[PDB]
Swiss-Prot record:
Cofactors named for this entry: Mn(2+)
EC assignment: 3.1.-.-
Gene: PA
Family: Belongs to the influenza viruses PA family.
First-tier enzyme category under EC: hydrolase
Entry PTM: Phosphorylated on serines and threonines by host kinases, including human casein kinase II.
Name under which the protein is recorded: Polymerase acidic protein
Entry GO CC: host cell cytoplasm; host cell nucleus
Domain of life of the source: Viruses
Amino acid sequence: RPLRLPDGPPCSQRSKFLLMDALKLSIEDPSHEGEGIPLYDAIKCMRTFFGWKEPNVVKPHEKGINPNYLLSWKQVLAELQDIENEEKIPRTKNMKKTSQLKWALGEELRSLASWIQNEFNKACELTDSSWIELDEIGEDAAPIEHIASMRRNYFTAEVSHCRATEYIMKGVYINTALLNASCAAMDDFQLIPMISKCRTKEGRRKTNLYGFIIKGRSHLRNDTDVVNFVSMEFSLTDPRLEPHKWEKYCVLEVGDMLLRSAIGHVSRPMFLYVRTNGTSKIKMKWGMEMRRCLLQSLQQIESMIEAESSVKEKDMTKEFFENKSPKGVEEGSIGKVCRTLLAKSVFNSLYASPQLEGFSAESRKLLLIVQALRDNLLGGLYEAIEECLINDPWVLLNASWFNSFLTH
Ligand SMILES: Fc1ccc(-n2ccnc2)cc1
């Protein structure tokens, strides 16, 4: 019996920032007066693009006030143009409490869509930039022993350029920026750049701008108190191809960009995905800890090497990572296994939900029971699992995968 997934309209994107659809404005080897202050970086990144144009709504949010989203983006540009005229650039920028910002800051069964699998495939790929330093993974106080060191360097080589790792660092940056603003600027609608940092294949340091968030008032007394925010993220993805993915967004067309491509130079429209959203102190603390995804994934690999090692009365680290008893690798390479485990850990973090917690525990129970019947040859457990298959894309996709592990 395969699990029954729900019927209904396709599920929609619900992460805190864009994943496969993001777009970066970037500055190489940055060195302007104030390199390392988010606002200065963001402006220098904005100054690298000359294709801006009069923005308009191309995919409206069906349940919000689309003129207010438009006005909020035009306000961001207008207030950044103001900083261009102030002699000293300030360290932070508090937006005017306009009617559009006050409104935007607050002052059902869904079937499985194909985009979430595509998102997961993209998260497993390699980018052309590295996102972590060589000794990033780990917290140890002492120098690490020789075997642990070898394992960490092999694993880091495989995941440092991984797209899942860019999501980790992107998520760590924005969650740190927002939580700091949440208490350093409680009464302000602070403009908060979405920044990441990477090193190219030639060693060049690069600073990237994905867009902006504007936080609401944040008098966060406890871990569960909510700070609302508005996110505005560049993208080359035309939202009119998969409109169901963007149910929660108003999408603007805000410029045109010249690109290298397989057909040579091409001009493509640039979009801005805008939605309102919220987070809590506890969720931002968790978002600051996303580098533990790297550690949790490494430890799953170290578990497999420990198994093979205690079987051969010998350390199997070199033999595992160099692919030397097994005569292949199902995913295709050891690198893909590392990046698939990483991607699972990152998406569990980016798409955390009670639905995910139930399905994770309850489907493990159904698995062990099925494995014990397959090697050696329930209606209430099946219900506890399917009570978590409601509308969450990550959970629905993991259930789709579970059915495949059932048919085999
Ligand atoms: F840093 C920048 C600030 C504003 C604009 N801009 C574009 C259209 N109007 C203002 C561009 C770059």
